[PDB]
Design a protein around this ligand. Structure first.
Ligand SMILES: *[C@@H]1O[C@H](CO)[C@@H](O[C@@H]2O[C@H](CO)[C@@H](O[C@@H]3O[C@H](CO[C@@H]4O[C@H](CO)[C@@H](O)[C@H](O[C@H]5O[C@H](CO)[C@@H](O)[C@H](O)[C@@H]5O)[C@@H]4O)[C@@H](O)[C@H](O)[C@@H]3O)[C@H](O)[C@H]2NC(C)=O)[C@H](O)[C@H]1NC(C)=O
Ligand SMILES: *[C@@H]1O[C@H](CO)[C@@H](O[C@@H]2O[C@H](CO)[C@@H](O[C@@H]3O[C@H](CO[C@@H]4O[C@H](CO)[C@@H](O)[C@H](O[C@H]5O[C@H](CO)[C@@H](O)[C@H](O)[C@@H]5O)[C@@H]4O)[C@@H](O)[C@H](O)[C@@H]3O)[C@H](O)[C@H]2NC(C)=O)[C@H](O)[C@H]1NC(C)=O
Ligand code: COH
Ligand code: COH
Ligand SMILES: *[C@@H]1O[C@H](CO)[C@@H](O[C@@H]2O[C@H](CO)[C@@H](O)[C@H](O)[C@H]2NC(C)=O)[C@H](O)[C@H]1NC(C)=O
Ligand SMILES: *[C@@H]1O[C@H](CO)[C@@H](O[C@@H]2O[C@H](CO)[C@@H](O)[C@H](O)[C@H]2NC(C)=O)[C@H](O)[C@H]1NC(C)=O
Ligand SMILES: *[C@@H]1O[C@H](CO)[C@@H](O[C@H]2O[C@H](CO)[C@@H](O)[C@H](O)[C@H]2NC(C)=O)[C@H](O)[C@H]1NC(C)=O
Ligand SMILES: *[C@@H]1O[C@H](CO)[C@@H](O[C@H]2O[C@H](CO)[C@@H](O)[C@H](O)[C@H]2NC(C)=O)[C@H](O)[C@H]1NC(C)=O
Ligand code: ACD
Ligand code: ACD
Ligand code: BOG
Ligand code: BOG
Ligand code: BOG
Ligand code: BOG
Ligand code: BOG
Ligand code: BOG
Ligand code: BOG
Ligand code: BOG
Lengths: 553, 553
């Protein structure tokens, strides 16, 4: 008997449950629908669904009225929209969390074992006809082929939104605090417990490692002057597990908090920047609170960075990305009147979706010089050689690459993408379409409809045999980009929910914590309330270079 | 310079912060008050405080209108009150959690290190004049003396509310899943991570121990027939760490999930009862879901018990306790429209406050027999000798003891109480009065006012020198009981908030989880929605004895 839940009968988030040897029941509870498979809109659901504009349309309004927006921007109408934005979007990620690689059903294990990444949709039953469930071929496209054929960059396509490398890296560094898949435990597990913006990639992810990094004096972090400028310390004082290549484990072999952050100047760069900031906060705090210990100074400064980060990420990172005219804003109080759970837990689909490797260029221009992957990767002096000031200016100036569209992932790293499609399969993630529904969209009716063109499209149909069988990662990256956008529809509609749910779900954002005494003093709060990429740098360097998440000109 | 926060200047939950070498500032944020120390009621706070009846009064209404209540009971007016009850009470326990033994301020460490118990009020600064802060003597009463003098039982005072031993034990067993102080880590730390009703005292508190107990077949739990009746298994199959005395580690040396549950028949009794229930659920589930695995069967049945427990605890345990005419009710949906965080974290004051050791009798009557502490403690056959049926009937019939009033803790265990007063001091818990304010009450103006009498009172003043210096645990147990109540005012007003916050804060109670498919089937939900002490027993025994949380007659 074929496991009925293999057809995904239940609609609108209705839970599919096996009853007896061959039947199933949908638990349409609170889905707004009723019926065998939840397809009978309650009175209000019916209204809502007949009045809600297509996402396509909203993205339109949000990217056009360059007059209506400037007005709306200078009025409460902003807070109103922002509050709307958050709620609606954030109301899509189940919390408390639901399933994990081990359980396709609620369980006390799932709730509490923070090691497990969590999923939005159950997984494809280990007994369904096809690998994706019902449609498709008994075999999925060879990820190696599907990769070089559609994801491999031929000619470098830059990002029309003007995104830049200074962003590309920040993106990598930042996301690496919640995404830390434990090789030992395999796919679907994570070292980075905490699931969020806890900067556990600066201060590390275990008390020890933290301590090993902590200079236990003035709540500061350990560091070393090179050329008279401050940099992170090396294992020779900061005796902590790293990943530098077997060659010079002593000097220029720096400890940071994120095990792998030495393998690229970009990461190590930012790493230098944040550490150099933390210690800066301390100086301020310490002057404001002489009678304070070390632990305090440390903890308080940390939170002030969890704030600064959550702010820059929203009012600048997500801004650039969106392309909106609405001026996104970070004000924890906007949700003070809603029903919101301050608690997140990184999802595997969120992980998958965040693999924006095509942002990476062809080479790395740092002034007249023009390093290559060989010269760049694992390099171990570019940072101290060039200097923060100079290296930020260099990244803030070179453009990044379009994330979507298809065929724009440099070859060097093209391997990452192949593993994702490999991993995705191990995890048994449901089909793109299934995830499209889940995030409030319509399933594509054809590859032609998916991809703006016809070539790529036809070739894929020929492979997957059915649009419904298409996969999560390939779809997202093979989907047509919104006009002049960094990427298509599905990336925002699927990403934003995971994104803001995690940004505002941080404890520091709850009413309980969002006080001026949580950042010890009014000086703390204001540091969190007025943060900026520009300040994050120019306040920790001798000189103010050019910096932003978008190229100038 | 004396640490100003030693005076506890800030009022109404205003955070005290040291600024400079000798000053301080109160962060009255969202306290409803403003001013140097938060003593200027906002317009509405002023209304609220001038219209809110004394707690003393409400306890009166709740324990008198035996006509108005029967009516109110048979109408929506019930749900209204219940919803009121929850919210207001639960809105007193900060969540996300605040401080811990290590930090008297918000911190990412405090939030995430689940090992730390958490506190409501900061601690007494390690530099304040007196041990309690400002008032009192440079030395606190000798806990040994203060104990025998006021907490040691002379004549057994039974509980007027009719509470019984069947309750006394359930109480002990149940509370032992959140209270597990780690000796290695010391006071203020806990083995029982999870902080709540996760039955991590049945299924254990680590995957291993659980597994070691799991019979990995039909999602059941390991067990052994003795006399033809089901009992937990012994380490000889359930190879797990226990605590039975060095004598017969083989048979009658049962494994349960709560390391110390062999040291008393009461605990082991209940232990037998729940295990015998879990397996029962499985039988039901398994028949409803043949196509189900083991993991599911297990996890689903677990949740069905986390439900059953949370229900019996509320509609029966808290009922008996309260003395209310209002018929408490467990309906997770009553909070569906509120702003409630489904997340708890046991507090140390909650721990302290729950030390109801005086519930314990003088001897243990089990029919014509009348065991003593020697015969009872560590006994290891009474359970299988007598039998669940018979031993429940025996406890449900013998009365327990009044918790408050003073002088009612049997000598045998009188030692526990002494450690509590010792520990309390290590933790540096603020004075009774400070905790009285914090939970919405008025500080006592005298010991005479505290204690209903004059003798005990005068002697204490003579010791503490000042009512304000009085301690948390001694105050609670030395406070005058509400007329005919099991204990006084401060126990309910301080206990209920910690209590319901933890009962309804359980993930299974959130909208997300409270579906019929979380207990797999409608059969599951109903098991959770109609649980009862009576059913918990009589459905897992050959015969229905007498059982309740109050003696008959
Ligand atoms: C979060 O969740 C992950 C799992 O998803 C946790 O990590 C896994 O943890 C389990 C258990 O800790 C571990 O178990 C594996 O299973 C092996 C099988 O064990 C044997 O088979 C049964 C199972 O208990 C026993 O009957 C066997 O008999 C034993 O009985 C004696 C009793 O004393 C034993 O002493 C003796 O060895 C005997 O064989 C036997 O145990 C197990 O042996 C082996 O250890 C193996 O690891 C998983 O492998 C873990 N790893 C992962 C990533 O899956 C993780 O701990 C959870 N996080 C937290 C903190 O809760
Ligand atoms: C929850 O929170 C509790 C704490 O409240 C955690 O448990 C405690 O954890 C800490 C650290 O893991 C542990 O530390 C103690 O401190 C000793 C001091 O260590 C020395 O002094 C400093 C501190 O790092 C170092 O400079 C010293 O030099 C060392 O440097 C080398 C670097 O490689 C070392 O290899 C070498 O040994 C050298 O000495 C030195 O480390 C520490 O040595 C000792 O281990 C001691 O335990 C506490 O004792 C822990 N216990 C408790 C209950 O307090 C708990 O882990 C947290 N929970 C979680 C899971 O996060
Ligand atoms: C948008 C973020 C981002 C960027 C810009 C980025 C840029 C680069 C880059 C350019 C200099 C190189 C050489 C690599 C190289 C790798 N990356 Co990324 N990675 C990024 C996000 C990730 C994530 C997420 C993972 C998966 C593992 C994890 O962290 O959970 C990853 C994994 C990898 C792996 C391990 C195998 C795999 O999972 O496929 C390699 C090798 N990489 N990455
Ligand atoms: C209302 C619950 C309850 C009951 C009825 C109860 C009944 C009994 C009892 C009667 C047969 C005996 C002989 C004991 C004996 C002890 N109890 Co309790 N205890 C109870 C709740 C606790 C708590 C709570 C602790 C503190 C440790 C922990 O679990 O965190 C405790 C601790 C102890 C300790 C360790 C030292 C200490 O912390 O003081 C001993 C010994 N006991 N207990
Ligand atoms: C790491 O980066 C440094 C730059 O700091 C590389 O050295 C540069 O190499 C280019 C040519 O490759 C020269 O024209 C520059 O003048 C060099 N700068 C300096 C001061 O070294 C170095 O080759 C890189 N290392 C690796 C592993 O390739
Ligand atoms: C443990 O409990 C048993 C009861 O099961 C105790 O045995 C009883 O002892 C009394 C007198 O103390 C006798 O009158 C009963 O008839 C006995 N019952 C049985 C069948 O043993 C036993 O003494 C206790 N053990 C300890 C350590 O005291
Ligand atoms: C509910 O979901 C099932 C599964 O998709 C739908 O399909 C079943 O019934 C169809 C109607 O004739 C048949 O086409 C299929 O043979 C049958 N498939 C399965 C898996 O049972 C069913 O139609 C849906 N019902 C509604 C209300 O649309
Ligand atoms: C605010 O709190 C402080 C601390 O309790 C109060 O006490 C200070 O001021 C009092 C007024 O004269 C003096 O009696 C004390 O010397 C002084 N003590 C301290 C610790 O500074 C202060 O009065 C309070 N202010 C208000 C508005 O009541
Ligand atoms: C859980 C930790 C925090 C993770 C998230 C932080 C940054 C994620 C970056 C992008 C998220 C995915 C899609 C974003 C696209 C447009 C943003 C605006 C959407 C909106 O508002 O309408
Ligand atoms: C965190 C896990 C759950 C712990 C709590 C479970 C049981 C606790 C028992 C008693 C709690 C403290 C005081 C109770 C007194 C009266 C109850 C009704 C109060 C009310 O409603 O007005
Ligand atoms: C408590 C009421 C808060 C304000 C309610 C605003 C209702 C907006 O409802 C609609 O929701 C849609 C989501 O699909 C959006 O796309 C629309 O722009 C929005 O107008
Ligand atoms: C003019 C802007 C009006 C408000 C825009 C809200 C932006 C989010 O947009 C909407 O969010 C919902 C929640 O996930 C989704 O169901 C919809 O598909 C999406 O378009
Ligand atoms: C208040 C109404 C303002 C004008 C609304 C015009 C909506 C135009 O429609 C939009 O056009 C885009 C490109 O032209 C498409 O990509 C979108 O799918 C479509 O919604
Ligand atoms: C406050 C939010 C109201 C809903 C979104 C309105 C989006 C308006 O969008 C744009 O407005 C311009 C006005 O000058 C027109 O010229 C554009 O054609 C129109 O698409
Ligand atoms: C959203 C409105 C929900 C119902 C509001 C009921 C207001 C009850 O307000 C009062 O609060 C006091 C707390 O100190 C109780 O003691 C009183 O009995 C209660 O009447
Ligand atoms: C007739 C019953 C009306 C509602 C009774 C509410 C029971 C709780 O009572 C009140 O709870 C508040 C919240 O902690 C406290 O501030 C008050 O001190 C307490 O009396
Ligand atoms: C609606 C009003 C109904 C009658 C209210 C009578 C309140 C009586 O008052 C109560 O008396 C108790 C003992 O007599 C005291 O213990 C309480 O402190 C007091 O509030
Ligand atoms: C629905 C809740 C209303 C507020 C609580 C009312 C408590 C009433 O309390 C009791 O009511 C009896 C009525 O017969 C009187 O005889 C008692 O003296 C009075 O104390």
């Amino acid at each position: 008997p074929v496991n009925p839940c293999c057809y995904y009968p239940c609609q609108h988030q209705g839970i599919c449950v096996r009853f007896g040897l061959d039947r199933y029941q949908c638990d349409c509870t609170r889905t707004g629908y009723s019926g065998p498979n939840c397809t009978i809109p309650e009175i209000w659901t019916w209204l809502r669904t007949t009045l809600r504009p297509s996402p396509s349309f909203i993205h339109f309004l949000l990217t056009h009225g360059r007059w209506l927006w400037d007005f709306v921007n200078a009025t409460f109408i902003r807070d109103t929209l922002m509050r709307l934005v958050l709620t609606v979007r954030s109301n899509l990620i189940p919390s408390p969390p639901t399933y994990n690689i081990a359980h396709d059903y609620i369980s006390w294990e799932s709730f509490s074992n923070v090691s497990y990444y969590t999923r939005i949709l159950p997984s494809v039953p280990r007994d369904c006809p096809t690998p994706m469930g019902t449609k498709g071929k008994k075999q999925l496209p060879d990820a190696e082929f599907l990769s070089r054929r559609f994801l491999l960059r031929r000619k470098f396509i830059p990002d029309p939104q003007g995104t830049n490398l200074m962003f590309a890296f920040f993106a990598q560094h930042f996301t690496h605090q919640f995404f830390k898949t434990s090789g030992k435990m395999g796919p679907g597990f994570t070292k980075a417990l905490g699931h969020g913006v806890d900067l556990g990639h600066i201060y590390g992810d275990n008390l020890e490692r933290q301590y090993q990094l902590r200079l236990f004096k003035d709540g500061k972090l350990k560091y070393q002057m090179l050329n008279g400028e401050v940099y992170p310390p090396s294992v020779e004082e900061a005796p902590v597990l790293m990943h530098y290549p077997r060659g010079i484990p002593p000097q220029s072999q720096m400890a940071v908090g994120q095990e792998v952050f030495g393998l690229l100047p970009g990461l190590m760069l930012y790493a230098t920047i944040w550490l150099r900031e933390h210690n800066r906060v301390c100086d301020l705090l310490k002057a404001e609170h002489p009678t304070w210990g070390d632990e305090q100074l440390f903890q308080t400064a940390r939170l002030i960075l969890i704030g600064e980060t959550i702010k820059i990420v929203i009012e600048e990172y997500v801004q650039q990305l969106s392309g909106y005219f609405l001026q996104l804003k970070f004000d924890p109080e906007l949700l003070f009147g809603a029903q919101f759970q301050y608690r997140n837990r990184i999802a595997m689909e969120f992980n998958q979706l965040y693999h924006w490797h095509p942002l990476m260029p062809d080479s790395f221009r740092v002034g007249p010089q023009d390093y290559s992957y060989e010269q760049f990767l694992f390099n171990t002096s570019m940072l101290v050689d060039y200097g923060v000031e100079a290296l930020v200016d260099a990244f803030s100036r070179q453009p990044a690459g379009r994330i979507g569209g298809g065929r724009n992932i440099d070859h060097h790293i093209l391997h990452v993408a192949v593993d994702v499609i490999k991993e995705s399969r191990v995890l048994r993630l449901q089909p793109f379409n299934e995830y499209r529904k889940r995030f409030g969209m319509k399933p594509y009716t054809s590859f032609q409809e998916l991809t703006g063109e016809k070539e790529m499209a036809a070739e894929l149909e020929e492979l997957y045999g059915d649009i419904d069988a298409l996969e999560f990662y390939p779809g997202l990256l093979l989907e047509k980009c919104h006009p002049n956008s960094i990427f298509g529809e599905s990336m925002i509609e699927m990403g934003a929910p995971f994104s803001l749910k995690g940004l505002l779900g941080n404890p520091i954002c709850s009413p309980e914590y969002w006080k001026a005494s949580t950042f010890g003093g009014e000086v703390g709060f204001n540091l969190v309330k007025t943060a900026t990429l520009k300040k994050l740098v120019c306040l920790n360097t001798k000189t103010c270079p050019y910096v932003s998440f978008h190229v100038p000109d």
